[PDB]
Amino acid sequence: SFVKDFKPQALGDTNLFKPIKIGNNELLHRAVIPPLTRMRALHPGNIPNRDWAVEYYTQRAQRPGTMIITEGAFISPQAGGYDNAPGVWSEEQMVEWTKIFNAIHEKKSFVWVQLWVLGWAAFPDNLARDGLRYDSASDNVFMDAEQEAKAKKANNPQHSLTKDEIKQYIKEYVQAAKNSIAAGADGVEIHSANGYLLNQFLDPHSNTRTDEYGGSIENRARFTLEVVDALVEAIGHEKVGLRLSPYGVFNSMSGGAETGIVAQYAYVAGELEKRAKAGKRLAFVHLVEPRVTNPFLTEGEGEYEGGSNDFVYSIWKGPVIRAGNFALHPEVVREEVKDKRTLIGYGRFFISNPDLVDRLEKGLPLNKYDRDTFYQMSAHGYIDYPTYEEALKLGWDKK
Amino acid sequence: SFVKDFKPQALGDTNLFKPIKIGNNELLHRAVIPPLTRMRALHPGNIPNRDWAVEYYTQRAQRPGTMIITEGAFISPQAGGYDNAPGVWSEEQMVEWTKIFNAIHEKKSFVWVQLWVLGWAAFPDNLARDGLRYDSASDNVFMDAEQEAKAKKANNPQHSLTKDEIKQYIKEYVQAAKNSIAAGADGVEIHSANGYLLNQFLDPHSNTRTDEYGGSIENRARFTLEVVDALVEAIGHEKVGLRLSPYGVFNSMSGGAETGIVAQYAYVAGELEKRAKAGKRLAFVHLVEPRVTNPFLTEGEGEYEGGSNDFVYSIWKGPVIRAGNFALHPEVVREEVKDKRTLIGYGRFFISNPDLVDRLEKGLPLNKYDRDTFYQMSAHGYIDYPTYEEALKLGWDKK
Ligand SMILES: Cc1cc2nc3c(=O)[nH]c(=O)nc-3n(C[C@H](O)[C@H](O)[C@H](O)COP(=O)(O)O)c2cc1C
Ligand SMILES: Cc1cc2nc3c(=O)[nH]c(=O)nc-3n(C[C@H](O)[C@H](O)[C@H](O)COP(=O)(O)O)c2cc1C
Ligand SMILES: O=Cc1ccc(O)cc1
Ligand SMILES: O=Cc1ccc(O)cc1
């Protein structure tokens, strides 16, 4: 059915429908599909889904000039730890991603691959099976109860990475970014948000190292910045984006409770503008908003109101993508896109509405999403949400 | 005469006229007098002016419950370097400040002493005369042309402070804060803005040290934070304020051009809130706005619009005083004081208008200031600006 007491608002008279150039791509509107894990990849191999993935992305690439950031894709087997999320390291995976990138490009939309490394969010037991380490920034701070339950049954204890093994992850980031561009993606987003490995090094709670990778603002940022710099040497700055969630608490990050958190993220933004002066301005910075500090909480739950992401605009002067409970708030979006360099990511309602961009443009009602199929191994809840037309033919009231 | 095409606006219906508690003081309105050097102190001795200073401050303390921050006062002779600015280190100076604090308190207003240390802004030649060093954070970066002219004629070269001599300045800050409270002041503001010594250690341009006082965000903040902590042990956190000018460029500071500047100031704000959790919340944070990056430029000149001070509010959760070209902009003030913990400093128009607070409350015209007497050794341009009544009796049109 459609979302119930939601009064939609048409947004075609705002800057969300003005064109903008992001990297090499000339987007025709500013509503982007943020990275969304759907756990339909095939095991063994972490292979993109052979039956359903091309249709899923072809459906969401239907409005020309749309920017799509894929689900997170593991850069290597050691980066992974979930059986049904995709990778971008082997020839069998890239054969299937090529077909997804060609289908999106035949629709005249764009496709950026999100590069993912789990760290302590990985299941230690899957990893133990495959012969791999359970990695994080440190060894004396765990994610939570059941993650330490997991690890000890599995006898796969949380490991602090050596400098050596941080370098190897940089090596794999470059290869996986080379692979995504060689199979035809328009660019890559470095996932450094939502509590996964690079964010575990950025956060003072998860990073109690005392070497060059821990202990100060600058050292805590060091791994994310080396990854930026290596991918910018490998494939060019106009093909790299960075995602940050300053105020997130998902996967045990500190959020607004850490008093030093704005300075930690202001430093990363200033180093990026530094590079932008020196010629290497990243295609964009993608921010998760305090409106959503945990993506497993229903919209409106877990909103952090003691801080804001607006400090990034005083520092970084390129495009920023902002995401977090914006589909149900067109009155908030109308204000945020008066800024001429701001794009809005829509996550959960792009899951239920293949044709979201038309619905935004025209103020049409919004299909409810079914949380129960976010992570099912099914076409149901994945490729069968109707467009507005089909939804009327189905009687979602109006028939 | 009155300011010419200025249309005033009455502000008595805003939060500028609601009471607020700052430290121990219950202010009756939120228009504060920011620190303003007027160079009427007597040489030798840096003695507050024996003839005119009590009247100057008594005139500006006329509206009950006003917070007044004094002109900068040197904590010791090595901190100084201008002959006619006051000090707060000797018995002869404190005899005269006592009389200023008693006169302000008989008017039922409050008085906070700004503690000043010049660093590289000092005249090296006055210092050479008196046997004192020309100090700064570093020795290979100078303030400007004529300051190095000065120094070499004077044969008094710019010196990088040793740890030892940084400790001695902390010793003198505590004594001078003990002296101000013992003579009767309500509190002290630590001057760490506008390019003077503590700001030279905070700024990456002026601070090229590689020891524990330079080289990173945390080390660059170290001297300002040790001074906060020493004065909070000495006299209590509800008697200490801190002034910061993130975006200032006066006295050769970096301003918005340094990409790392917001992170440098976000770190200082986060450490202060850290302490606020641990029980020691400073009475206030005083910020100079990007609206004024050099106080020698006429209002509207040198406005920095690529950044904002609003990031401090996501981090520090106590009172903030904001200053910078707000007297000519009541439409801007009306918006800024919707925030329930914001006070507005008025510098240059509190020089020409002893009765500014009534004029703000009622929307009355504003006396022009005479820049030519900001630093003269005269009563003229100091104690003879009229109140609105006297100005009408004088015919400043209306007679
Ligand atoms: C099912 C689901 C999967 C997600 N997968 C990812 C992911 O792979 N990487 C990522 O950075 N964010 C991920 N997110 C976070 C979203 O990109 C987004 O920031 C969050 O949902 C807030 O936007 P929303 O309120 O519009 O949905 C996911 C969110 C959901 C609900
Ligand atoms: C004559 C004059 C003397 C000043 N003296 C000081 C001082 O002693 N310490 C300080 O922190 N700021 C000093 N300032 C800066 C002001 O406090 C204030 O931040 C600046 O004037 C901007 O406010 P305005 O636009 O209202 O005047 C001075 C400014 C002027 C014009
Ligand atoms: O729900 C899956 C998920 C994956 C990666 C994220 O970044 C956030 C959520
Ligand atoms: O004009 C004098 C002056 C003194 C101290 C400051 O902080 C700023 C200006």
XYZ file of N, CA, C and O in Angstrom, chain B residues 51-163:
452
model
N 42.802 59.699 36.172
C 41.844 60.763 36.036
C 40.537 60.352 35.385
O 39.522 60.937 35.710
N 40.507 59.372 34.470
C 39.407 59.187 33.511
C 38.835 57.793 33.466
O 37.698 57.669 33.037
N 39.577 56.766 33.874
C 39.125 55.392 33.724
C 37.893 55.044 34.561
O 36.992 54.311 34.122
N 37.817 55.530 35.804
C 36.664 55.237 36.621
C 35.433 55.847 35.970
O 34.411 55.180 35.830
N 35.422 57.067 35.503
C 34.280 57.639 34.829
C 33.916 56.896 33.559
O 32.736 56.717 33.242
N 34.876 56.506 32.743
C 34.601 55.784 31.504
C 33.756 54.508 31.743
O 32.789 54.232 31.033
N 34.177 53.707 32.719
C 33.576 52.426 33.014
C 32.266 52.665 33.770
O 31.311 51.950 33.515
N 32.171 53.645 34.690
C 30.944 54.045 35.427
C 29.955 54.454 34.338
O 28.815 54.027 34.372
N 30.292 55.237 33.321
C 29.338 55.561 32.278
C 28.791 54.389 31.497
O 27.636 54.426 31.038
N 29.603 53.376 31.289
C 29.150 52.257 30.496
C 28.497 51.174 31.333
O 27.887 50.238 30.791
N 28.581 51.309 32.661
C 27.964 50.360 33.572
C 26.619 50.884 34.004
O 26.106 50.244 34.913
N 26.032 51.913 33.341
C 24.829 52.578 33.788
C 23.532 51.793 33.736
O 22.600 52.024 34.522
N 23.422 50.851 32.817
C 22.236 50.015 32.778
C 22.549 48.866 33.743
O 23.485 48.110 33.505
N 21.840 48.676 34.854
C 21.995 47.569 35.812
C 22.060 46.206 35.126
O 21.288 45.968 34.179
N 22.911 45.324 35.660
C 23.006 43.948 35.253
C 23.776 43.802 33.949
O 23.598 42.752 33.319
N 24.632 44.773 33.557
C 25.448 44.695 32.375
C 26.721 43.955 32.680
O 27.350 44.197 33.704
N 27.155 43.031 31.821
C 28.468 42.389 31.910
C 29.518 43.234 31.197
O 29.338 43.520 30.016
N 30.629 43.664 31.811
C 31.632 44.475 31.149
C 32.925 43.654 31.150
O 33.336 43.143 32.214
N 33.617 43.437 30.023
C 34.915 42.755 30.010
C 35.880 43.929 29.820
O 35.629 44.802 28.987
N 36.929 44.115 30.615
C 37.753 45.274 30.543
C 38.606 45.156 29.278
O 38.757 44.106 28.619
N 39.250 46.281 28.960
C 40.388 46.317 28.037
C 41.398 45.230 28.363
O 41.421 44.772 29.508
N 42.233 44.739 27.436
C 43.239 43.751 27.822
C 44.219 44.303 28.860
O 44.649 45.460 28.771
N 44.620 43.480 29.822
C 45.491 43.959 30.864
C 46.624 42.996 30.891
O 46.431 41.781 30.870
N 47.855 43.469 30.915
C 48.999 42.617 30.830
C 49.163 41.870 32.108
O 48.998 42.489 33.145
N 49.526 40.590 32.138
C 49.659 39.792 33.358
C 51.007 40.060 34.013
O 51.220 39.696 35.158
N 51.995 40.666 33.343
C 53.340 40.891 33.826
C 54.068 41.787 32.830
O 53.547 42.068 31.730
N 55.243 42.337 33.148
C 55.938 43.216 32.234
C 56.410 42.504 30.994
O 56.385 43.075 29.918
N 56.833 41.229 31.104
C 57.260 40.446 29.934
C 56.093 40.183 28.975
O 56.317 39.865 27.797
N 54.843 40.176 29.467
C 53.599 39.997 28.697
C 53.234 41.246 27.904
O 52.478 41.119 26.955
N 53.845 42.390 28.210
C 53.453 43.640 27.703
C 54.288 44.084 26.591
O 54.746 43.246 25.819
N 54.525 45.377 26.497
C 55.194 45.855 25.321
C 54.539 47.096 24.775
O 55.077 47.627 23.793
N 53.392 47.573 25.299
C 52.765 48.848 24.897
C 52.762 49.718 26.148
O 52.247 49.266 27.157
N 53.280 50.942 26.172
C 53.397 51.722 27.381
C 52.157 52.212 28.033
O 52.096 52.520 29.245
N 51.161 52.319 27.184
C 49.955 52.854 27.697
C 48.801 51.890 27.761
O 47.618 52.273 27.715
N 49.052 50.610 27.904
C 47.960 49.697 28.156
C 48.251 49.333 29.593
O 49.430 49.302 30.006
N 47.201 49.016 30.353
C 47.305 48.641 31.780
C 47.804 47.273 32.118
O 47.805 46.369 31.245
N 48.321 47.104 33.330
C 48.708 45.788 33.780
C 47.889 45.437 35.020
O 47.204 46.278 35.626
N 48.044 44.191 35.434
C 47.343 43.656 36.593
C 48.346 42.882 37.474
O 48.061 41.859 38.085
N 49.623 43.278 37.491
C 50.611 42.578 38.273
C 51.058 43.381 39.487
O 51.535 42.787 40.451
N 51.001 44.705 39.567
C 51.640 45.358 40.708
C 50.629 45.971 41.620
O 49.473 46.182 41.223
N 51.043 46.282 42.852
C 50.166 46.909 43.832
C 49.694 48.241 43.328
O 48.540 48.551 43.574
N 50.504 49.086 42.687
C 49.990 50.391 42.239
C 48.889 50.278 41.175
O 48.016 51.122 41.062
N 48.960 49.286 40.304
C 47.929 49.054 39.311
C 46.682 48.587 40.020
O 45.618 49.135 39.718
N 46.788 47.632 40.957
C 45.590 47.076 41.593
C 44.875 48.077 42.450
O 43.663 48.013 42.488
N 45.545 49.099 42.997
C 44.894 50.135 43.713
C 43.921 50.856 42.819
O 42.811 51.264 43.267
N 44.283 51.007 41.532
C 43.403 51.726 40.612
C 42.319 50.872 40.014
O 41.210 51.352 39.850
N 42.582 49.622 39.715
C 41.539 48.700 39.273
C 40.490 48.519 40.359
O 39.314 48.421 40.030
N 40.832 48.458 41.660
C 39.836 48.330 42.743
C 38.774 49.411 42.697
O 37.573 49.182 42.835
N 39.224 50.609 42.417
C 38.322 51.681 42.296
C 37.458 51.539 41.058
O 36.304 51.973 41.072
N 37.953 51.022 39.937
C 37.127 50.794 38.789
C 36.150 49.720 39.179
O 34.964 49.969 38.995
N 36.511 48.571 39.799
C 35.562 47.473 40.082
C 34.495 47.950 41.071
O 33.313 47.594 40.961
N 34.842 48.764 42.080
C 33.842 49.283 43.011
C 32.835 50.194 42.345
O 31.637 50.076 42.628
N 33.257 51.063 41.448
C 32.348 51.949 40.742
C 31.408 51.174 39.863
O 30.239 51.506 39.737
N 31.860 50.134 39.184
C 30.986 49.315 38.322
C 29.966 48.559 39.192
O 28.752 48.486 38.899
N 30.461 47.964 40.305
C 29.574 47.260 41.196
C 28.630 48.224 41.893
O 27.495 47.818 42.090
N 28.919 49.472 42.243
C 27.931 50.371 42.802
C 26.820 50.602 41.756
O 25.699 50.941 42.119
N 27.052 50.415 40.446
C 26.027 50.538 39.435
C 25.310 49.235 39.250
O 24.441 49.166 38.395
N 25.612 48.185 39.983
C 24.970 46.899 39.833
C 25.186 46.221 38.475
O 24.363 45.444 37.976
N 26.383 46.450 37.926
C 26.868 45.717 36.775
C 28.075 44.896 37.250
O 28.468 44.920 38.450
N 28.646 44.103 36.301
C 29.653 43.087 36.579
C 30.903 43.395 35.822
O 30.777 44.165 34.851
N 32.044 42.815 36.193
C 33.289 43.230 35.571
C 34.237 42.042 35.505
O 34.478 41.399 36.520
N 34.678 41.672 34.313
C 35.567 40.552 34.114
C 36.874 41.087 33.542
O 36.775 41.879 32.608
N 38.074 40.672 33.971
C 39.274 41.320 33.499
C 39.809 40.493 32.352
O 39.885 39.271 32.537
N 40.165 41.055 31.181
C 40.734 40.274 30.137
C 42.258 40.169 30.368
O 42.962 41.180 30.377
N 42.801 38.960 30.464
C 44.214 38.828 30.672
C 44.923 38.757 29.328
O 44.670 37.791 28.591
N 45.879 39.667 29.048
C 46.500 39.820 27.759
C 47.983 39.517 27.778
O 48.688 39.904 28.690
N 48.551 38.811 26.797
C 50.008 38.554 26.613
C 50.224 38.762 25.082
O 49.564 38.064 24.280
N 51.126 39.681 24.682
C 51.259 40.156 23.318
C 51.969 39.235 22.382
O 51.628 39.181 21.208
N 52.992 38.543 22.801
C 53.765 37.767 21.840
C 54.371 38.703 20.788
O 54.786 39.852 21.043
N 54.208 38.304 19.519
C 54.898 38.996 18.457
C 54.238 40.285 18.131
O 54.793 40.981 17.276
N 53.115 40.649 18.774
C 52.497 41.928 18.500
C 53.042 43.097 19.306
O 52.805 44.291 19.032
N 53.888 42.739 20.240
C 54.581 43.694 21.088
C 55.582 44.564 20.336
O 56.086 44.149 19.278
N 55.904 45.799 20.766
C 56.964 46.558 20.083
C 58.343 46.095 20.521
O 58.641 46.346 21.696
N 59.285 45.510 19.781
C 60.490 44.869 20.321
C 61.417 45.865 20.986
O 62.179 45.523 21.898
N 61.273 47.122 20.551
C 62.044 48.223 21.056
C 61.649 48.705 22.427
O 62.506 49.148 23.204
N 60.368 48.645 22.803
C 60.030 49.026 24.160
C 60.611 47.998 25.130
O 61.092 48.245 26.235
N 60.504 46.758 24.666
C 60.895 45.597 25.404
C 62.390 45.611 25.594
O 62.864 45.355 26.698
N 63.151 45.842 24.542
C 64.601 45.997 24.588
C 65.057 47.029 25.647
O 65.920 46.792 26.507
N 64.406 48.180 25.661
C 64.593 49.198 26.685
C 64.485 48.670 28.084
O 65.245 49.041 28.959
N 63.469 47.840 28.336
C 63.181 47.429 29.698
C 63.888 46.173 30.096
O 63.709 45.650 31.191
N 64.677 45.633 29.195
C 65.434 44.422 29.487
C 64.675 43.151 29.174
O 65.141 42.096 29.622
N 63.602 43.175 28.346
C 62.735 41.991 28.212
C 62.857 41.339 26.837
O 63.266 42.018 25.908
N 62.552 40.055 26.701
C 62.569 39.361 25.418
C 61.456 39.747 24.481
O 60.432 40.228 24.952
N 61.629 39.541 23.173
C 60.570 39.714 22.170
C 60.179 38.278 21.919
O 60.894 37.539 21.233
N 59.044 37.832 22.441
C 58.667 36.440 22.422
C 57.724 35.928 21.371
O 56.849 36.659 20.967
N 57.769 34.726 20.876
C 56.645 34.195 20.146
C 56.779 32.679 20.219
O 57.547 32.097 20.989
N 55.933 32.055 19.450
C 55.886 30.632 19.396
C 57.125 30.138 18.705
O 57.712 29.152 19.141
N 57.525 30.826 17.620
C 58.670 30.442 16.777
C 59.591 31.622 16.441
O 59.357 32.798 16.750
N 60.729 31.322 15.833
C 61.730 32.324 15.522
C 61.987 32.507 14.080
O 62.734 33.353 13.673
N 61.422 31.690 13.268
C 61.657 31.766 11.853
C 60.391 32.240 11.174
O 60.274 31.877 10.013
N 59.403 32.919 11.795
C 58.204 33.388 11.123
C 57.941 34.687 11.848
O 57.806 34.725 13.062
N 57.862 35.761 11.140
C 57.664 37.032 11.759
C 56.266 37.562 11.482
O 55.548 37.023 10.635
N 55.841 38.610 12.206
C 54.499 39.154 12.066
C 54.346 39.911 10.758
O 53.380 39.636 10.030
N 55.256 40.853 10.478
C 55.254 41.647 9.249
C 56.568 42.464 9.159
O 57.315 42.608 10.141
N 56.648 43.202 8.061
C 57.719 44.098 7.681
C 58.302 44.977 8.760
O 59.466 44.844 9.120
N 57.458 45.869 9.281
C 57.933 46.826 10.233
C 58.217 46.255 11.607
O 58.931 46.928 12.367
N 57.721 45.029 11.915
C 57.884 44.408 13.203
C 59.220 43.832 13.079
O 59.934 43.934 14.079
N 59.630 43.272 11.925
C 61.056 42.854 11.861
C 62.035 44.045 11.733
O 63.157 43.993 12.258
N 61.569 45.170 11.146
C 62.358 46.409 11.083
C 62.725 46.781 12.526
O 63.916 46.830 12.874
N 61.644 46.876 13.333
C 61.723 47.240 14.717
C 62.711 46.439 15.510
O 63.624 46.998 16.145
N 62.585 45.147 15.331
C 63.346 44.204 16.099
C 64.791 44.304 15.827
O 65.560 44.313 16.771
N 65.181 44.377 14.575
C 66.601 44.430 14.338
C 67.159 45.782 14.722
O 68.137 45.717 15.433
N 66.602 46.963 14.427
C 67.133 48.218 14.936
C 67.335 48.059 16.441
O 68.429 48.253 16.945
N 66.340 47.476 17.116
C 66.351 47.310 18.543
C 67.249 46.247 19.021
O 67.423 46.011 20.214
N 67.750 45.515 18.070
C 68.591 44.356 18.321
C 67.957 43.396 19.314
O 68.538 42.827 20.249
N 66.666 43.160 19.101
C 65.888 42.337 20.024
C 65.141 41.365 19.136
O 64.067 41.622 18.612
N 65.790 40.269 18.845
C 65.280 39.259 17.927
C 64.135 38.396 18.468
O 64.154 38.097 19.650
N 63.201 37.939 17.609
C 62.058 37.143 18.013
C 62.573 35.797 18.474
O 63.290 35.118 17.740
N 62.141 35.407 19.665
C 62.552 34.231 20.403
C 61.493 33.133 20.495
O 60.369 33.524 20.841
N 61.766 31.825 20.292
C 60.800 30.779 20.530
C 60.961 30.463 21.954
O 62.079 30.325 22.416
N 59.860 30.440 22.668
C 59.777 30.236 24.106
C 60.263 28.853 24.425
O 59.950 27.934 23.680
N 60.911 28.612 25.544
C 61.305 27.268 25.917
C 60.128 26.799 26.757
O 59.296 27.610 27.216
N 60.039 25.505 27.046
C 58.990 24.959 27.888
C 58.980 25.691 29.191
O 57.961 26.115 29.678
